[PDB]
Design a protein around this nucleic acid. Sequence first.
RNA 1: ACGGAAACCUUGAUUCUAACGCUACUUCUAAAUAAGCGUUA
Length: 105
Amino acid sequence: MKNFKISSTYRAARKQQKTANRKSFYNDEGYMISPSEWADGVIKGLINPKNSWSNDHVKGYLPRVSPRSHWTKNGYREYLGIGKSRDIPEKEPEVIEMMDLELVV
RNA sequence: ACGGAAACCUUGAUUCUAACGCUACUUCUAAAUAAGCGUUA
């Protein structure tokens, strides 16, 4: 994930909805566990501490992610993925002949 | 040195002929190999 970054609106929403203050923890099978047993499993090695917790939920359907920018050769700004998005029109499509087909109104 | 001696209750005979442990009965009834994708970036 390099073309996009975390949006500032979502970061502000998460910050002052305090969703990181209400984390949920999981064991290696992805089942909700109390923070005490999560700590005990992480210390024992039975849980990977990295991918085993969630930052609650942010409400309001905000865009989580915004395009990231970089510097072109002349010092102008540009979106990272705008210019290397595509080069060929992928050929396609295929026009299948299906004149014998009863459509439904 | 006896109402005593001698004398097979014996011979020949198939407990045999005929007869289906048989008639009827669905291993049957419902059921998508399918559901969840969070949070961080």
